[PDB]
Ligand binder design. Structure first.
Ligand SMILES: Cc1cc2nc3c(=O)[nH]c(=O)nc-3n(C[C@H](O)[C@H](O)[C@H](O)COP(=O)(O)OP(=O)(O)OC[C@H]3O[C@@H](n4cnc5c(N)ncnc54)[C@H](O)[C@@H]3O)c2cc1C
Ligand SMILES: Cc1cc2nc3c(=O)[nH]c(=O)nc-3n(C[C@H](O)[C@H](O)[C@H](O)COP(=O)(O)OP(=O)(O)OC[C@H]3O[C@@H](n4cnc5c(N)ncnc54)[C@H](O)[C@@H]3O)c2cc1C
Ligand SMILES: *SCCNC(=O)CCNC(=O)[C@H](O)C(C)(C)COP(=O)(O)OP(=O)(O)OC[C@H]1O[C@@H](n2cnc3c(N)ncnc32)[C@H](O)[C@@H]1OP(=O)(O)O
Ligand SMILES: *SCCNC(=O)CCNC(=O)[C@H](O)C(C)(C)COP(=O)(O)OP(=O)(O)OC[C@H]1O[C@@H](n2cnc3c(N)ncnc32)[C@H](O)[C@@H]1OP(=O)(O)O
Lengths: 444, 444
């Protein structure tokens, strides 16, 4: 009857909705540190670029809707500072008044996500130095752009967010530099596929600095330069996007098990090792279909799936989480960048014997107008030929190909079985053999 | 050592290539009625519309390449009139001289495709009345357009070719009418999905006449009108696209088994019931993954797959054809029309107990600019919830969704398992739950 959920976004409220729909008697309390529930963090770079009208558009469901329509006791400005798992009590501090409130639970869900990491650099706190995670973060970036005169923007780190924001700043007419860490080389894309990204950045005059370490941010009250071990470069706005940390700090003192980075370990049913305590989303570990290990790939698709499953399992409607594939997709300038399953760094790390096939092809029939190049790479087990992963890069039809690859991986297909699938074809959409199938044929 | 292939296009030459690559000794003779090998019939409507420069662009590999590079004895203007399966002799007529040649075989492949059907209507042979199958057919259509004043075009029959050519004729600035057949209502799309097609045609001023029967084409030397049981309408060019017949006539008296429509029955290995005689592509039957029966769905993807498999199996490199899903995709004006697996008429026809889910959705996040409506319908088994088929209609992301559905059908997935797949998402490509997954969730 008493369900408590910590975190009022994707994982937390996906759970809440399951509970509310499948238990009419349920008393659901949700505890959110901020003032905004159920919003799309994914849309933030597109609000900042002006492509979306306002952050208001990103809100999927109101706290007022959660309260009035669904009868969920949704709290705002409630930061949980500790949980007593023996007494089954959650302790929340109001972020403004600092008053402490107790919430007893029969079942608890931790859905606190991750936070972006700001390393302890001199200049950390300078005006115009930004992280991007929340709606307030986006507004503050917009406020820097609106007041302060911004010509040069430096992005620290890459990955999805760094790349998307490099585009956003280019589209806002800025001169964009990216400074890239060595610790993230090959983590998403293999070297040969990443070449297409460097080429596209160069093409749009996004300066990318490799093997260069941030030393400090310089300026008065506002930032005006980035200092590295190799130089000092003008910057009127710095976005730091170098890594994330699970928001699980507050659970020190409980016996709740955590991986090395602090992500909460969950079994098939979203349960921690502590009785009646569940976790879901970016704050939790993610069973990997191919790795067969509990990984951490904090993404919004997985968070909704895990959150929905946490709610269901909290209701004893037993259903197992099938896993992540490490699927990810990025819009970067004119390119679409997609990956799923294992890349070479991942395969090597697991000591899985693998081979690769790469094809430079097109998204559709070469004779059809506006046919575009399509770069597609697959990994497969050298013994069983089990498909292990794929990377697709091009202007069009990249999402289609990665979803097909994802489906293949989910079903544990052999690479050559792809040849046998009746995939769709007409000249404006594909070639008579899909690029995936052409690559499959090249495999041993 | 002696391999003979009848038909010099997709199925026949996919086979020849397999044989040539996997047997160095092989003497391959290919017998082709026309003068053009290995061309994309699929691109024909796009040459006629002007989108593709010329028919030459559709040729994937020519007879000179087959002869000089691959050592295939590729014959043109050779029409096979007779096969003696006991003596293992193929009899061919030269189409010009009418001289008779004979070809001895160890293994034979029939890859003769289908032909468009011209019903026995008065006016059949009037100038401006056209079938569309071959490059010469397209040139003849272009010739009618170049030398005559065409303003009104009438198309007999819907289907993929009918709809594509309706587009082509609208794009050429013509007033287009199409007169649809009642026998083919619900064969591709369910009634509720077909509504979207009728709406889009109406929007572009394509007159569609329902339950109306053609009785004659009228005119002096050329067509000037089409007469039906309900009226007589002006037409300067008539395209008849009402069905196809397997080119298997010539095999009468061989004991080669054939279905009711004349398509050659093949087993898993592309073998007919007659020793050392194979068949593949449009002239052959197509084992259906979902129907679990030998169907006939003649398209170019299946033709290449079957032709490739026939060559391999002719070399005793034993490999089973996994089947068709009945996948099909059409560009129609602003819409993309995709279907795969079973529709309602097919499910009912088989007495497979089924339910449906239909979702009016978008191709991506609703808040993202240029997000477009997406209409998606799924069929699934009442008892096991096994996915049975899908129909998707919309402006963008239709091909992606049908290929995902195709993959699911190939793997015999239950509808709710789709909820678990780590499909890709970023705002420019999808919603955080794919439309297929949202439909899956509505299912019982
Ligand atoms: C710029 C950006 C772009 C992205 N793009 C994509 C994309 O294209 N595709 C994709 O799949 N994913 C994307 N993501 C990731 C996606 O936004 C997240 O994976 C998803 O929001 C995770 O949901 P969650 O509920 O686990 O965590 P969150 O959405 O982070 O929610 C956790 C909530 O818990 C609250 N909280 C934390 N600690 C406490 C506490 N102690 N007490 C009370 N409340 C607390 C926080 O205020 C927060 O609201 C993107 C993320 C960012 C930042
Ligand atoms: C307008 C149009 C659009 C199409 N669009 C698509 C599409 O978008 N997607 C798709 O998948 N498919 C499409 N198709 C279908 C695709 O073109 C065919 O399925 C494919 O060409 C079939 O290959 P095949 O080798 O079995 O037969 P064919 O390609 O028809 O080749 C058979 C050959 O056999 C020869 N032949 C016949 N009889 C004899 C004989 N007695 N002796 C010697 N030779 C003989 C013929 O001359 C012919 O060249 C389209 C077809 C048309 C007409
Ligand atoms: S950066 C991307 C990550 N961020 C976000 O997703 C944004 C924050 N999102 C959330 O917090 C959740 O995604 C919310 C908005 C809470 C989703 O809540 P719900 O789970 O209630 O989602 P829906 O409102 O879409 O409801 C889903 C269930 O309702 C059934 N259903 C929907 N529509 C219909 C119709 N028309 N007819 C019948 N049923 C319908 C669905 O089947 C679904 O049922 P389940 O039982 O939940 O599968
Ligand atoms: S309307 C659409 C239907 N119409 C048509 O398809 C047009 C007519 N088409 C055809 O007749 C055939 O599709 C043709 C053009 C004959 C294709 O013949 P091939 O089967 O020879 O096709 P490829 O030339 O692509 O060769 C395929 C085999 O070669 C291997 N391969 C290609 N490229 C490479 C590279 N770079 N490196 C290694 N191997 C390569 C493929 O793996 C493939 O091998 P298989 O053993 O056949 O799988």
């Amino acid at each position: 009857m008493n369900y408590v959920i910590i975190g009022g976004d994707a994982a937390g409220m996906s759970a809440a909705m399951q509970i509310v729909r499948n238990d009419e008697n349920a008393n659901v309390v949700t505890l959110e540190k901020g003032e905004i529930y159920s919003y799309a963090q994914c849309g933030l770079p597109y609000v900042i670029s002006g492509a979306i009208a306002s952050t208001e558009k990103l809100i999927a469901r109101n706290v007022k809707t959660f309260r009035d329509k669904y009868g969920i006791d949704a709290k705002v400005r409630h930061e949980v500072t500790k949980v007593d798992t023996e007494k089954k009590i959650v302790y929340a501090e109001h972020t403004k008044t600092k008053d402490v409130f107790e919430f007893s639970y029969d079942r608890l869900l931790i859905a606190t996500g991750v936070r972006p990491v700001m390393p302890e650099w001199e200049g950390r706190d300078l005006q115009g130095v930004h992280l991007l995670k929340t709606i307030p973060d986006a507004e503050r970036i917009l406020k820097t752009l609106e007041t302060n005169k911004v010509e040069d923007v430096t992005i620290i780190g890459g990955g999805a967010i760094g790349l998307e924001m490099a585009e956003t700043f280019v589209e806002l007419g800025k001169k964009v530099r990216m400074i890239e860490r060595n610790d993230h080389i090959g983590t998403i894309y293999d070297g040969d596929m990443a070449e297409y990204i460097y080429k596209e950045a160069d093409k749009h005059h996004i300066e990318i600095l490799t093997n260069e370490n941030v030393k400090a941010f310089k300026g008065n009250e506002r930032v005006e330069a980035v200092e590295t071990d190799k130089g000092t470069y003008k910057a009127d706005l710095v976005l730091v996007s170098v890594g994330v940390k699970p928001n699980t700090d507050f659970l020190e003192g409980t016996n709740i098990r955590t991986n090395h980075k602090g992500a909460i370990e969950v079994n098939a049913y979203m349960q921690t090792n502590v009785q009646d305590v569940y976790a879901a989303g970016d704050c939790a570990t993610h069973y990997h279909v191919i790795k067969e290990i509990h990984d951490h790939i904090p993404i919004g698709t997985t968070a909704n799936k895990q959150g929905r499953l946490a709610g269901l399992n909290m209701l004893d409607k037993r259903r197992a989480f099938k896993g992540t594939l490490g699927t990810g997709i990025i819009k970067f300038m004119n390119l679409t960048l997609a990956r799923t399953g294992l890349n070479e760094k991942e395969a090597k790390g697991l000591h899985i014997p693998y081979k690769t096939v790469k094809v430079d092809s097109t998204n559709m029939a070469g004779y059809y107008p506006n046919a575009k190049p399509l770069y597609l790479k697959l990994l497969y087990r050298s013994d069983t030929k089990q498909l292990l992963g794929g990377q697709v890069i091009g202007e069009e039809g990249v999402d289609k190909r990665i979803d097909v690859i994802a489906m293949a991986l989910f079903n544990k297909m052999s690479i050559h079985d792809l040849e046998d699938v009746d995939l769709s074809y007409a000249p404006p959409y594909n070639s008579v053999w899909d690029p995936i199938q052409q690559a499959a044929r090249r495999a041993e």
